[PDB]
Design an enzyme around this catalytic site. Structure first.
Site, mmCIF file in Angstrom:
data_model
loop_
_atom_site.group_PDB
_atom_site.id
_atom_site.type_symbol
_atom_site.label_atom_id
_atom_site.label_comp_id
_atom_site.label_asym_id
_atom_site.label_seq_id
_atom_site.Cartn_x
_atom_site.Cartn_y
_atom_site.Cartn_z
ATOM 1 N N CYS A 95 -2.412 6.064 -4.461
ATOM 2 C CA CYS A 95 -1.188 6.770 -4.907
ATOM 3 C C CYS A 95 -0.471 5.876 -5.916
ATOM 4 O O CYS A 95 -1.115 5.242 -6.796
ATOM 5 C CB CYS A 95 -0.318 7.164 -3.689
ATOM 6 S SG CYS A 95 0.100 5.853 -2.533
ATOM 7 N N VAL A 96 0.847 5.845 -5.906
ATOM 8 C CA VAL A 96 1.502 5.010 -6.917
ATOM 9 C C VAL A 96 1.611 3.571 -6.366
ATOM 10 O O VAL A 96 1.162 2.623 -7.030
ATOM 11 C CB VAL A 96 2.902 5.595 -7.288
ATOM 12 C CG1 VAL A 96 3.592 4.616 -8.274
ATOM 13 C CG2 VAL A 96 2.738 6.998 -7.998
#
Length: 163
Positions: free
Chosen positions: A106-107
């Site tokens: 994800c981030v």
């Protein structure tokens, strides 16, 4: 000494959270990482075949023949992620069967990706008590990475599914 480790971790001995840095290999073919790790996937000597992008936006990787699969997950405390567990773990299982390396990210590489990786490891557990295995995987990955599935809704949904 692993029982001691888990019991101290579980009764107030958790460290302050820190942002993960490098990718973490979790199985023969499955890796957990953040956005920078994904940007670096085309140049990695791992030879990724797939990237599972769990962020809210689609992106592409120019030079790369990597197949990027986009499953936008919402990192908040109300939204369901359980509808994705079986489809995600079956795909990760297939990558491991086929020896096709895959990066799940994800981030920050903490909540959305951490939860899918936790689900996968739970799905592959055949010999241990699910309660014990959950504690072991949770604390060990958090210590390795700095932060791991801090989102308590996500932990609740994994516990409901696998424990």
């Amino acid at each position: 000494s692993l029982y001691k480790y888990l019991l101290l971790r579980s009764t107030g001995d958790m460290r302050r959270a820190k942002s993960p840095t490098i990718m973490t290999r979790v199985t023969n073919n499955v890796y957990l990482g953040n956005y920078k790790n994904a940007m670096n996937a085309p140049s990695s000597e791992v030879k990724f075949k797939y990237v599972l992008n769990l962020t809210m936006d689609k992106y592409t990787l120019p030079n790369s023949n990597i197949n990027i699969i986009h499953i936008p997950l919402v990192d908040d405390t109300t939204t369901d992620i359980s509808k994705y567990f079986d489809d995600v773990t079956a795909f990760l299982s297939k990558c491991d069967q086929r020896n096709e390396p895959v990066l799940v990210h994800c981030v920050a590489g903490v909540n959305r990706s951490g939860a899918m990786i936790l689900a996968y490891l739970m799905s592959k557990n055949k010999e241990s008590s699910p309660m014990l295995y959950f504690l072991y995987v949770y604390h060990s990955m958090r210590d390795l990475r700095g932060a791991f599935v801090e989102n308590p809704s996500f932990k609740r949904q994994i516990i409901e599914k696998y424990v």
